[PDB]
């Protein structure tokens, strides 16, 4: 509706018998393939990310925001638990650091 991409702001400009909008948008540019998981088992309990997504740089797992790669350590303050992990599909074992 307001330009192509994630809209930040717009600036109106006047033209004869019309108007012109300058749609400022946020377009992600460089993407990297990653390995992901919907959750992780820590002590038989499934951990899901709150406002984030799990990714792996290889031998280690992190959690980051979807629209930008800002990897972070997985912690209880950064994830929420819901039940065991015999029902989820694609879950992977890992440690959840407790600050």
């Amino acid at each position: 509706f307001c330009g192509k991409g994630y809209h930040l702001m717009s600036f109106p400009q006047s033209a004869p018998h019309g108007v012109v909008f300058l749609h400022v948008t946020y377009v992600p540019a460089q993407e990297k393939n990653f390995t992901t998981a919907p959750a992780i088992c820590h002590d038989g309990k499934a951990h899901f990310p709150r406002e984030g997504v799990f990714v792996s740089n290889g031998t280690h797992w992190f959690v980051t925001q979807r629209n930008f790669y800002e990897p972070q350590i997985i912690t209880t303050d950064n994830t929420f638990v819901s039940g065991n992990c015999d029902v989820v599909i694609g879950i992977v074992n890992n440690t959840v650091y407790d600050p």
Binding site: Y6, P28, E31, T36, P38, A46, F48, V53, I89
Partner: protein
């Protein structure tokens, strides 16, 4: 086919020029409408040969290769439910000749100056655009509409959507099979509603 009437019409004036201007504007507007609706993505995305979408079945909205026009199963029904006139824009003088004009309506419309122009986009090409959109929204989600497509597992995409409607992403994972079965049954119900008589 009258010289006298034509030479009189030349005097009566040129209103037919503006009539044709209006009709041409209408036709160009129709082409623009089709482009605006379907041609929202220039990158044509192909569905991956592997179809592990977390149990979701999109084999009934995605194209079927074994047809002259690569079209889905729920588009063939729609096409067969709307009956265009002659489904063709070439009616030769020979076919209309021989007392078939008063019988066929198109021949009558065409002996009297009225013609139907063909659209700039074929049905197969529109289907290609739609298939690209489906592949993009399946493999990448809503990212392909903001720039370059970013692959994501379908289950996690649905989890993001659930978070969008104010439902925790755990609900989807803990009930993935049930949701997939519901979706597949609902997509079969559309076929029943369309392949039936209505």
């Amino acid at each position: 086919d009258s010289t006298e009437c034509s030479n009189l019409l030349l005097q009566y004036g040129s209103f037919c020029t503006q009539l044709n201007r209006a009709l041409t504007g209408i036709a160009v507007e129709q082409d623009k409408n089709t482009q605006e609706v379907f041609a929202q993505v220039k990158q044509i995305y192909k569905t991956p040969p592997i179809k592990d979408f977390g149990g979701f079945n999109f084999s009934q909205i995605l194209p079927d290769p074994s047809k002259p026009s690569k079209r889905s199963f729920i588009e063939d029904l729609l096409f067969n439910k709307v009956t265009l006139a002659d489904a063709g824009f070439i009616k030769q003088y020979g076919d209309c000749l021989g007392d078939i004009a008063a019988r066929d309506l198109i021949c009558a419309q065409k002996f009297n100056g009225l013609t139907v122009l063909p659209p700039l986009l074929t049905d197969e090409m529109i289907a290609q655009y739609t298939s690209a959109l489906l592949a993009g929204t399946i493999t990448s989600g809503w990212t392909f509409g903001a720039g370059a497509a970013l692959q994501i597992p379908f289950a996690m995409q649905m989890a993001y959507r659930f978070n969008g409607i104010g439902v925790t992403q755990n609900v989807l994972y803990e009930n993935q099979k049930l949701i997939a079965n519901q979706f597949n049954s609902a997509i079969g119900k559309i076929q029943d509603s369309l392949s039936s008589t209505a």
